Design a protein around this ligand. Structure first.
Ligand SMILES: CCOC(=O)Nc1cccc2c1[nH]c1ncnc(NN3CCCC3=O)c12
Ligand SMILES: [Cl-]
Length: 167
């Protein structure tokens, strides 16, 4: 048993809710919140901008030190950093950005990072400003992640479409 509340169960291990991931994280304080990161960990907008804003820019400060030491992530890759006031840890995962021409096939690799964590609160990778079809992202999530994932979908109309179209 865990403290995630109000989720619809899609599969044995995937759950979904219409929620603002920032508010969900602040309420639940999960062990792991997933950020929709880019390779430079520049948290300017979308989920990343909102998560970083909620940390009063501490996420960005930590991220800039990480990049200065390690260089950029790979598309499809991840790193574990602090969750600040939102979670114990933040798993920064880079899904392919279709608006940059990045290979949508890398979305499966991105979701594989979730399997290193028993339970996660996460957004749909490559959705929103990353330009992929969220219905496709949900399918890849369900077919790739084997650990317990709680998906927060900000947009109510999209949430309803994701549920109603789920196979
Ligand atoms: C002050 C904090 O409040 C907010 O950021 N609210 C808010 C506004 C607009 C969109 C989202 C949002 N929260 C979200 N959490 C998670 N995925 C969000 N969108 N995506 C990104 C990919 C698919 C999707 O529904 C949003
Ligand atoms: Cl977004």
């Amino acid at each position: 048993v865990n403290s995630f509340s109000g989720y619809l169960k899609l599969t044995d291990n995937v759950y979904i809710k219409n929620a603002d991931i920032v508010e969900e994280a602040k309420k639940v304080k999960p062990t792991v919140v997933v950020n929709a990161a880019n390779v430079y960990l520049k948290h300017g907008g979308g989920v990343a901008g909102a998560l970083n804003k909620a940390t009063n820019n501490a996420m960005q400060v930590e991220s800039d030190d990480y990049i200065a030491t390690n260089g950029p992530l790979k598309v499809g890759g991840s790193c574990v950093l602090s969750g600040h006031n939102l979670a114990k840890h933040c798993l920064h995962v880079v899904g392919p950005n279709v608006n940059k021409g990045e290979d949508i096939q890398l979305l499966k690799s991105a979701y594989e990072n979730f399997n290193q964590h028993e339970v996660l609160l996460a957004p749909l990778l490559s959705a929103g400003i990353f330009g992929a079809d969220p219905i496709h992202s949900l399918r890849v999530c369900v077919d790739t992640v084997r650990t317990n994932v709680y998906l927060a979908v900000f947009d109510k109309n999209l949430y309803d479409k994701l549920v109603s179209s789920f196979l």
